[PDB]
Amino acid sequence: YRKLQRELEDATETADAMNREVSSLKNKLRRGDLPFVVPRRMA
Amino acid sequence: ASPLEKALDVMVSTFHKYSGKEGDKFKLNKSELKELLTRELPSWLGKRTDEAAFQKLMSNLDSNRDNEVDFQEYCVFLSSIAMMSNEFFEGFPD
Amino acid sequence: MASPLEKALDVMVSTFHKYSGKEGDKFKLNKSELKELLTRELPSWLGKRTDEAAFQKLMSNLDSNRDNEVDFQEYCVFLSSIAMMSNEFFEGFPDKQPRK
Ligand SMILES: [Ca+2]
Ligand SMILES: [Ca+2]
Ligand SMILES: [Ca+2]
Ligand SMILES: [Ca+2]
């Protein structure tokens, strides 16, 4: 385990911005805006 | 399947090992998140037990303000950890 | 000692650097390096367009800070989106769906 307190808390202080970025990208993939990549898991 | 493909599947399986124990089947409550962290990410536990810090972690991760950590929020958690591991990987050349 | 999830996080980091360190900025993926990483390490996730224009569109949308590179954080945003697709497949099944 770590040698300090709070490193996970420190590392997640901007989780909101990252969630908003992930939401944006996931939406583009889902909608077929980036057809180099699949919109859904496939075999 | 490549190691990276398998790794992404471990992210999914590990989430569901805990998310279905209580309440919402597809989200982690505080108790479930605590179990996941303690049992699957013990390398990231703080030096001292610290409930206040854990509460703050939960609050930080709950970006949509629903008192749960869903799969996306959990991916952001894991990304945040990976980013620290990456800082270590890059930051200490010999 | 390390759990499968701890090992998985190490694979996220190691795989990135296998490609990022080939050319130029050794800690970011240029177009060529990203393309190799995707084609070699995420082949199950490649869609129906394989042309360079489609690839450029992907690169552009992963490169949120427009420095013509995909850094580690930008790469994690992409991996998270892929994991979410797998999760949506997983959650489509009945709770006691058999597995190994
Ligand atoms: Ca739950
Ligand atoms: Ca939430
Ligand atoms: Ca590079
Ligand atoms: Ca960039």
PDB file of C-alpha atoms and ligand atoms in Angstrom:
ATOM      1  CA  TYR A   1       0.000   0.000   0.000  1.00  0.00           C
ATOM      2  CA  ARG A   2       1.028   3.676  -0.264  1.00  0.00           C
ATOM      3  CA  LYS A   3       3.377   5.658   1.983  1.00  0.00           C
ATOM      4  CA  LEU A   4       1.018   8.618   2.180  1.00  0.00           C
ATOM      5  CA  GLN A   5      -2.557   9.576   2.701  1.00  0.00           C
ATOM      6  CA  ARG A   6      -4.867  11.068   0.139  1.00  0.00           C
ATOM      7  CA  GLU A   7      -3.182  10.273  -3.155  1.00  0.00           C
ATOM      8  CA  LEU A   8      -6.350   8.745  -4.630  1.00  0.00           C
ATOM      9  CA  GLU A   9      -8.353  11.723  -3.424  1.00  0.00           C
ATOM     10  CA  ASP A  10      -5.763  14.065  -5.020  1.00  0.00           C
ATOM     11  CA  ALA A  11      -5.843  12.121  -8.287  1.00  0.00           C
ATOM     12  CA  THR A  12      -9.651  12.358  -8.572  1.00  0.00           C
ATOM     13  CA  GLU A  13     -10.252  16.047  -7.831  1.00  0.00           C
ATOM     14  CA  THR A  14     -10.970  16.649 -11.537  1.00  0.00           C
ATOM     15  CA  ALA A  15     -13.022  13.512 -12.154  1.00  0.00           C
ATOM     16  CA  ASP A  16     -15.933  15.646 -13.341  1.00  0.00           C
ATOM     17  CA  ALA A  17     -14.018  16.992 -16.323  1.00  0.00           C
ATOM     18  CA  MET A  18     -12.823  13.519 -17.239  1.00  0.00           C
ATOM     19  CA  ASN A  19     -16.346  12.091 -17.024  1.00  0.00           C
ATOM     20  CA  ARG A  20     -17.555  14.834 -19.359  1.00  0.00           C
ATOM     21  CA  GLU A  21     -14.759  13.987 -21.839  1.00  0.00           C
ATOM     22  CA  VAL A  22     -15.562  10.270 -21.693  1.00  0.00           C
ATOM     23  CA  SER A  23     -19.262  10.994 -22.175  1.00  0.00           C
ATOM     24  CA  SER A  24     -18.495  13.070 -25.238  1.00  0.00           C
ATOM     25  CA  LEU A  25     -16.264  10.443 -26.835  1.00  0.00           C
ATOM     26  CA  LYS A  26     -18.577   7.541 -26.013  1.00  0.00           C
ATOM     27  CA  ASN A  27     -21.456   9.434 -27.622  1.00  0.00           C
ATOM     28  CA  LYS A  28     -19.454  10.010 -30.813  1.00  0.00           C
ATOM     29  CA  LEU A  29     -18.559   6.314 -30.994  1.00  0.00           C
ATOM     30  CA  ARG A  30     -22.129   5.184 -30.310  1.00  0.00           C
ATOM     31  CA  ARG A  31     -23.607   7.484 -32.984  1.00  0.00           C
ATOM     32  CA  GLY A  32     -21.212   6.143 -35.623  1.00  0.00           C
ATOM     33  CA  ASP A  33     -19.338   9.443 -35.939  1.00  0.00           C
ATOM     34  CA  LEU A  34     -15.994   7.636 -35.720  1.00  0.00           C
ATOM     35  CA  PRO A  35     -16.441   4.532 -37.893  1.00  0.00           C
ATOM     36  CA  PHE A  36     -12.735   3.658 -37.720  1.00  0.00           C
ATOM     37  CA  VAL A  37     -13.951   2.167 -34.412  1.00  0.00           C
ATOM     38  CA  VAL A  38     -17.011  -0.018 -33.774  1.00  0.00           C
ATOM     39  CA  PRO A  39     -20.089   1.547 -32.097  1.00  0.00           C
ATOM     40  CA  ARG A  40     -20.750  -1.637 -30.063  1.00  0.00           C
ATOM     41  CA  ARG A  41     -18.737  -4.628 -28.966  1.00  0.00           C
ATOM     42  CA  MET A  42     -18.852  -7.229 -31.673  1.00  0.00           C
ATOM     43  CA  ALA A  43     -17.409 -10.719 -32.063  1.00  0.00           C
TER      44      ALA A  43
ATOM     45  CA  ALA B   1      -7.325 -11.297 -27.576  1.00  0.00           C
ATOM     46  CA  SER B   2      -4.350  -9.042 -26.861  1.00  0.00           C
ATOM     47  CA  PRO B   3      -3.238  -8.288 -23.315  1.00  0.00           C
ATOM     48  CA  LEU B   4      -4.853  -4.858 -23.585  1.00  0.00           C
ATOM     49  CA  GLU B   5      -8.150  -6.324 -24.770  1.00  0.00           C
ATOM     50  CA  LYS B   6      -8.086  -8.802 -21.880  1.00  0.00           C
ATOM     51  CA  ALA B   7      -7.239  -6.003 -19.448  1.00  0.00           C
ATOM     52  CA  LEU B   8     -10.312  -4.008 -20.482  1.00  0.00           C
ATOM     53  CA  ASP B   9     -12.417  -7.126 -19.859  1.00  0.00           C
ATOM     54  CA  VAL B  10     -10.898  -7.448 -16.358  1.00  0.00           C
ATOM     55  CA  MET B  11     -12.088  -3.879 -15.691  1.00  0.00           C
ATOM     56  CA  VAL B  12     -15.616  -4.980 -16.524  1.00  0.00           C
ATOM     57  CA  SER B  13     -15.570  -8.277 -14.650  1.00  0.00           C
ATOM     58  CA  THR B  14     -14.049  -6.776 -11.514  1.00  0.00           C
ATOM     59  CA  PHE B  15     -16.695  -4.042 -11.357  1.00  0.00           C
ATOM     60  CA  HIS B  16     -19.479  -6.599 -11.452  1.00  0.00           C
ATOM     61  CA  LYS B  17     -17.838  -8.764  -8.812  1.00  0.00           C
ATOM     62  CA  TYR B  18     -18.873  -6.011  -6.402  1.00  0.00           C
ATOM     63  CA  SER B  19     -21.632  -3.930  -7.975  1.00  0.00           C
ATOM     64  CA  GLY B  20     -24.276  -6.623  -7.686  1.00  0.00           C
ATOM     65  CA  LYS B  21     -23.850  -7.299  -3.961  1.00  0.00           C
ATOM     66  CA  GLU B  22     -26.211  -4.539  -2.729  1.00  0.00           C
ATOM     67  CA  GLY B  23     -28.816  -2.150  -4.073  1.00  0.00           C
ATOM     68  CA  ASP B  24     -28.402  -1.076  -7.688  1.00  0.00           C
ATOM     69  CA  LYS B  25     -27.013  -4.106  -9.513  1.00  0.00           C
ATOM     70  CA  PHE B  26     -24.936  -2.006 -11.917  1.00  0.00           C
ATOM     71  CA  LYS B  27     -23.469   0.589  -9.557  1.00  0.00           C
ATOM     72  CA  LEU B  28     -21.126   0.612  -6.595  1.00  0.00           C
ATOM     73  CA  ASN B  29     -22.350   2.040  -3.339  1.00  0.00           C
ATOM     74  CA  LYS B  30     -19.780   3.190  -0.748  1.00  0.00           C
ATOM     75  CA  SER B  31     -19.527  -0.253   0.856  1.00  0.00           C
ATOM     76  CA  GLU B  32     -19.020  -1.999  -2.487  1.00  0.00           C
ATOM     77  CA  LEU B  33     -16.432   0.540  -3.627  1.00  0.00           C
ATOM     78  CA  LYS B  34     -14.582   0.111  -0.350  1.00  0.00           C
ATOM     79  CA  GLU B  35     -14.474  -3.666  -0.848  1.00  0.00           C
ATOM     80  CA  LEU B  36     -13.277  -3.314  -4.432  1.00  0.00           C
ATOM     81  CA  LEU B  37     -10.515  -0.907  -3.439  1.00  0.00           C
ATOM     82  CA  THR B  38      -9.424  -2.968  -0.446  1.00  0.00           C
ATOM     83  CA  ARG B  39      -9.469  -6.354  -2.133  1.00  0.00           C
ATOM     84  CA  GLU B  40      -8.566  -5.525  -5.742  1.00  0.00           C
ATOM     85  CA  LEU B  41      -6.498  -2.327  -5.423  1.00  0.00           C
ATOM     86  CA  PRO B  42      -4.729  -2.720  -2.067  1.00  0.00           C
ATOM     87  CA  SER B  43      -1.566  -1.230  -3.582  1.00  0.00           C
ATOM     88  CA  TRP B  44      -3.469   2.096  -3.584  1.00  0.00           C
ATOM     89  CA  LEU B  45      -4.656   2.097   0.016  1.00  0.00           C
ATOM     90  CA  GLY B  46      -3.359   4.967   2.129  1.00  0.00           C
ATOM     91  CA  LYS B  47      -0.719   4.271   4.769  1.00  0.00           C
ATOM     92  CA  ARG B  48      -3.231   4.698   7.594  1.00  0.00           C
ATOM     93  CA  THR B  49      -6.866   3.718   7.666  1.00  0.00           C
ATOM     94  CA  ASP B  50      -8.726   6.954   6.850  1.00  0.00           C
ATOM     95  CA  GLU B  51     -12.494   6.975   6.568  1.00  0.00           C
ATOM     96  CA  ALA B  52     -12.613  10.715   5.881  1.00  0.00           C
ATOM     97  CA  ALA B  53     -10.336  10.346   2.891  1.00  0.00           C
ATOM     98  CA  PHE B  54     -12.386   7.432   1.627  1.00  0.00           C
ATOM     99  CA  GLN B  55     -15.595   9.458   1.886  1.00  0.00           C
ATOM    100  CA  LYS B  56     -13.936  12.214  -0.108  1.00  0.00           C
ATOM    101  CA  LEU B  57     -12.853   9.712  -2.772  1.00  0.00           C
ATOM    102  CA  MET B  58     -16.435   8.507  -3.122  1.00  0.00           C
ATOM    103  CA  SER B  59     -17.668  12.088  -3.444  1.00  0.00           C
ATOM    104  CA  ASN B  60     -14.989  12.889  -6.015  1.00  0.00           C
ATOM    105  CA  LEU B  61     -15.906   9.885  -8.152  1.00  0.00           C
ATOM    106  CA  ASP B  62     -19.680  10.465  -8.022  1.00  0.00           C
ATOM    107  CA  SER B  63     -19.667  13.037 -10.805  1.00  0.00           C
ATOM    108  CA  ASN B  64     -23.391  12.666 -11.639  1.00  0.00           C
ATOM    109  CA  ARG B  65     -24.352  13.198  -7.967  1.00  0.00           C
ATOM    110  CA  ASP B  66     -26.498  10.105  -7.491  1.00  0.00           C
ATOM    111  CA  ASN B  67     -24.672   8.672  -4.445  1.00  0.00           C
ATOM    112  CA  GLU B  68     -23.326   5.765  -6.475  1.00  0.00           C
ATOM    113  CA  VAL B  69     -20.307   5.016  -8.629  1.00  0.00           C
ATOM    114  CA  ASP B  70     -21.428   3.717 -12.007  1.00  0.00           C
ATOM    115  CA  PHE B  71     -19.273   1.976 -14.573  1.00  0.00           C
ATOM    116  CA  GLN B  72     -18.195   5.157 -16.344  1.00  0.00           C
ATOM    117  CA  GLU B  73     -17.290   6.833 -13.056  1.00  0.00           C
ATOM    118  CA  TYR B  74     -15.310   3.725 -12.153  1.00  0.00           C
ATOM    119  CA  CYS B  75     -13.415   3.877 -15.464  1.00  0.00           C
ATOM    120  CA  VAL B  76     -12.501   7.448 -14.561  1.00  0.00           C
ATOM    121  CA  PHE B  77     -11.287   6.167 -11.175  1.00  0.00           C
ATOM    122  CA  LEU B  78      -9.126   3.516 -12.833  1.00  0.00           C
ATOM    123  CA  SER B  79      -7.839   6.039 -15.388  1.00  0.00           C
ATOM    124  CA  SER B  80      -6.829   8.344 -12.551  1.00  0.00           C
ATOM    125  CA  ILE B  81      -4.831   5.529 -10.960  1.00  0.00           C
ATOM    126  CA  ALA B  82      -3.279   4.583 -14.306  1.00  0.00           C
ATOM    127  CA  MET B  83      -2.265   8.223 -14.810  1.00  0.00           C
ATOM    128  CA  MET B  84      -0.340   8.131 -11.525  1.00  0.00           C
ATOM    129  CA  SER B  85       1.317   4.869 -12.533  1.00  0.00           C
ATOM    130  CA  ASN B  86       2.172   6.515 -15.809  1.00  0.00           C
ATOM    131  CA  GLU B  87       3.720   9.524 -14.045  1.00  0.00           C
ATOM    132  CA  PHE B  88       5.948   7.083 -12.151  1.00  0.00           C
ATOM    133  CA  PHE B  89       6.770   5.197 -15.373  1.00  0.00           C
ATOM    134  CA  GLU B  90       7.900   8.373 -17.137  1.00  0.00           C
ATOM    135  CA  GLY B  91       9.162  10.492 -14.300  1.00  0.00           C
ATOM    136  CA  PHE B  92      12.197   8.704 -12.925  1.00  0.00           C
ATOM    137  CA  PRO B  93      14.736   7.929 -15.672  1.00  0.00           C
ATOM    138  CA  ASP B  94      18.233   6.608 -14.823  1.00  0.00           C
TER     139      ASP B  94
ATOM    140  CA  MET C   1       0.324 -10.634  -4.986  1.00  0.00           C
ATOM    141  CA  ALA C   2      -1.028  -8.233  -7.650  1.00  0.00           C
ATOM    142  CA  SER C   3      -4.699  -8.657  -8.481  1.00  0.00           C
ATOM    143  CA  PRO C   4      -5.913  -9.060 -12.032  1.00  0.00           C
ATOM    144  CA  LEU C   5      -7.133  -5.449 -11.925  1.00  0.00           C
ATOM    145  CA  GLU C   6      -3.762  -4.156 -10.715  1.00  0.00           C
ATOM    146  CA  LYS C   7      -2.113  -6.113 -13.537  1.00  0.00           C
ATOM    147  CA  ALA C   8      -4.640  -4.699 -16.007  1.00  0.00           C
ATOM    148  CA  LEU C   9      -3.717  -1.133 -15.056  1.00  0.00           C
ATOM    149  CA  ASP C  10      -0.042  -1.968 -15.645  1.00  0.00           C
ATOM    150  CA  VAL C  11      -0.950  -3.280 -19.101  1.00  0.00           C
ATOM    151  CA  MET C  12      -2.687   0.045 -19.888  1.00  0.00           C
ATOM    152  CA  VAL C  13       0.547   1.862 -19.082  1.00  0.00           C
ATOM    153  CA  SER C  14       2.999  -0.574 -20.683  1.00  0.00           C
ATOM    154  CA  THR C  15       1.029  -0.867 -23.926  1.00  0.00           C
ATOM    155  CA  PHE C  16       0.887   2.898 -24.355  1.00  0.00           C
ATOM    156  CA  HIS C  17       4.656   3.191 -24.065  1.00  0.00           C
ATOM    157  CA  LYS C  18       5.379   0.277 -26.351  1.00  0.00           C
ATOM    158  CA  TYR C  19       4.142   2.611 -29.107  1.00  0.00           C
ATOM    159  CA  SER C  20       4.586   6.156 -27.738  1.00  0.00           C
ATOM    160  CA  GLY C  21       8.330   5.682 -27.383  1.00  0.00           C
ATOM    161  CA  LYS C  22       8.943   4.778 -31.033  1.00  0.00           C
ATOM    162  CA  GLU C  23       9.072   8.288 -32.509  1.00  0.00           C
ATOM    163  CA  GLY C  24       9.246  11.968 -31.629  1.00  0.00           C
ATOM    164  CA  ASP C  25       7.672  12.806 -28.277  1.00  0.00           C
ATOM    165  CA  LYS C  26       8.447   9.569 -26.500  1.00  0.00           C
ATOM    166  CA  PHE C  27       5.541  10.016 -24.076  1.00  0.00           C
ATOM    167  CA  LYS C  28       2.749  10.726 -26.567  1.00  0.00           C
ATOM    168  CA  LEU C  29       1.286   8.846 -29.525  1.00  0.00           C
ATOM    169  CA  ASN C  30       1.577  10.464 -32.940  1.00  0.00           C
ATOM    170  CA  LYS C  31      -0.738   9.333 -35.750  1.00  0.00           C
ATOM    171  CA  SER C  32       1.523   6.485 -36.859  1.00  0.00           C
ATOM    172  CA  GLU C  33       1.998   5.161 -33.322  1.00  0.00           C
ATOM    173  CA  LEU C  34      -1.715   5.362 -32.460  1.00  0.00           C
ATOM    174  CA  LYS C  35      -2.578   3.509 -35.636  1.00  0.00           C
ATOM    175  CA  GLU C  36      -0.162   0.688 -34.775  1.00  0.00           C
ATOM    176  CA  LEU C  37      -1.485   0.472 -31.205  1.00  0.00           C
ATOM    177  CA  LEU C  38      -5.090   0.254 -32.427  1.00  0.00           C
ATOM    178  CA  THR C  39      -4.464  -2.236 -35.230  1.00  0.00           C
ATOM    179  CA  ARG C  40      -2.129  -4.475 -33.214  1.00  0.00           C
ATOM    180  CA  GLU C  41      -3.545  -4.242 -29.683  1.00  0.00           C
ATOM    181  CA  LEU C  42      -7.265  -3.475 -30.239  1.00  0.00           C
ATOM    182  CA  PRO C  43      -8.074  -5.381 -33.423  1.00  0.00           C
ATOM    183  CA  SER C  44     -11.469  -6.551 -32.171  1.00  0.00           C
ATOM    184  CA  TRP C  45     -12.515  -2.903 -31.899  1.00  0.00           C
ATOM    185  CA  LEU C  46     -11.760  -1.785 -35.461  1.00  0.00           C
ATOM    186  CA  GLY C  47     -14.858  -0.670 -37.353  1.00  0.00           C
ATOM    187  CA  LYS C  48     -15.969  -0.808 -40.950  1.00  0.00           C
ATOM    188  CA  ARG C  49     -13.925   2.158 -42.178  1.00  0.00           C
ATOM    189  CA  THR C  50     -10.178   1.565 -42.467  1.00  0.00           C
ATOM    190  CA  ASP C  51      -9.185   4.509 -44.677  1.00  0.00           C
ATOM    191  CA  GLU C  52      -6.798   7.243 -43.560  1.00  0.00           C
ATOM    192  CA  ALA C  53      -9.504   9.917 -43.574  1.00  0.00           C
ATOM    193  CA  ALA C  54     -11.489   7.872 -41.039  1.00  0.00           C
ATOM    194  CA  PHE C  55      -8.359   7.365 -39.004  1.00  0.00           C
ATOM    195  CA  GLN C  56      -7.572  11.087 -39.063  1.00  0.00           C
ATOM    196  CA  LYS C  57     -11.089  11.837 -37.818  1.00  0.00           C
ATOM    197  CA  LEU C  58     -10.522   9.476 -34.888  1.00  0.00           C
ATOM    198  CA  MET C  59      -7.112  11.011 -34.139  1.00  0.00           C
ATOM    199  CA  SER C  60      -8.610  14.486 -34.232  1.00  0.00           C
ATOM    200  CA  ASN C  61     -11.353  13.536 -31.783  1.00  0.00           C
ATOM    201  CA  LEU C  62      -8.981  11.796 -29.354  1.00  0.00           C
ATOM    202  CA  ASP C  63      -6.604  14.756 -29.505  1.00  0.00           C
ATOM    203  CA  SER C  64      -8.783  17.045 -27.392  1.00  0.00           C
ATOM    204  CA  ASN C  65      -6.052  19.635 -26.787  1.00  0.00           C
ATOM    205  CA  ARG C  66      -5.135  19.793 -30.488  1.00  0.00           C
ATOM    206  CA  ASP C  67      -1.376  19.274 -30.216  1.00  0.00           C
ATOM    207  CA  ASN C  68      -1.399  16.548 -32.882  1.00  0.00           C
ATOM    208  CA  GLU C  69      -0.595  13.912 -30.267  1.00  0.00           C
ATOM    209  CA  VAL C  70      -2.567  11.560 -28.057  1.00  0.00           C
ATOM    210  CA  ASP C  71      -1.235  11.813 -24.525  1.00  0.00           C
ATOM    211  CA  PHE C  72      -1.812   9.308 -21.749  1.00  0.00           C
ATOM    212  CA  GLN C  73      -4.916  11.013 -20.383  1.00  0.00           C
ATOM    213  CA  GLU C  74      -6.467  11.252 -23.880  1.00  0.00           C
ATOM    214  CA  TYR C  75      -5.686   7.568 -24.357  1.00  0.00           C
ATOM    215  CA  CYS C  76      -7.429   6.714 -21.045  1.00  0.00           C
ATOM    216  CA  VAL C  77     -10.529   8.611 -22.222  1.00  0.00           C
ATOM    217  CA  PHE C  78     -10.545   6.301 -25.271  1.00  0.00           C
ATOM    218  CA  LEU C  79      -9.929   3.105 -23.293  1.00  0.00           C
ATOM    219  CA  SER C  80     -12.704   4.035 -20.861  1.00  0.00           C
ATOM    220  CA  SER C  81     -15.097   4.410 -23.790  1.00  0.00           C
ATOM    221  CA  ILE C  82     -14.129   0.946 -25.099  1.00  0.00           C
ATOM    222  CA  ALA C  83     -14.524  -0.644 -21.649  1.00  0.00           C
ATOM    223  CA  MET C  84     -17.978   0.970 -21.454  1.00  0.00           C
ATOM    224  CA  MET C  85     -18.970  -0.742 -24.714  1.00  0.00           C
ATOM    225  CA  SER C  86     -17.933  -4.062 -23.205  1.00  0.00           C
ATOM    226  CA  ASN C  87     -19.881  -3.259 -20.066  1.00  0.00           C
ATOM    227  CA  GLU C  88     -23.022  -2.554 -22.124  1.00  0.00           C
ATOM    228  CA  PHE C  89     -22.607  -6.001 -23.723  1.00  0.00           C
ATOM    229  CA  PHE C  90     -22.075  -7.560 -20.271  1.00  0.00           C
ATOM    230  CA  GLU C  91     -25.127  -5.906 -18.705  1.00  0.00           C
ATOM    231  CA  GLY C  92     -27.404  -6.950 -21.566  1.00  0.00           C
ATOM    232  CA  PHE C  93     -27.385 -10.517 -20.198  1.00  0.00           C
ATOM    233  CA  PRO C  94     -29.606 -11.957 -17.453  1.00  0.00           C
ATOM    234  CA  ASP C  95     -27.964 -11.790 -14.010  1.00  0.00           C
ATOM    235  CA  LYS C  96     -27.383 -15.551 -13.708  1.00  0.00           C
ATOM    236  CA  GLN C  97     -26.172 -15.938 -17.297  1.00  0.00           C
ATOM    237  CA  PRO C  98     -23.584 -18.721 -17.193  1.00  0.00           C
ATOM    238  CA  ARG C  99     -19.877 -17.914 -17.270  1.00  0.00           C
ATOM    239  CA  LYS C 100     -16.470 -19.325 -16.441  1.00  0.00           C
TER     240      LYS C 100
HETATM  241 CA    CA D   1     -24.603  -2.107  -6.022  1.00  0.00          CA
HETATM  242 CA    CA D   2     -22.693   8.504  -9.723  1.00  0.00          CA
HETATM  243 CA    CA D   3       5.749   9.198 -29.833  1.00  0.00          CA
HETATM  244 CA    CA D   4      -3.326  15.829 -27.525  1.00  0.00          CA
END
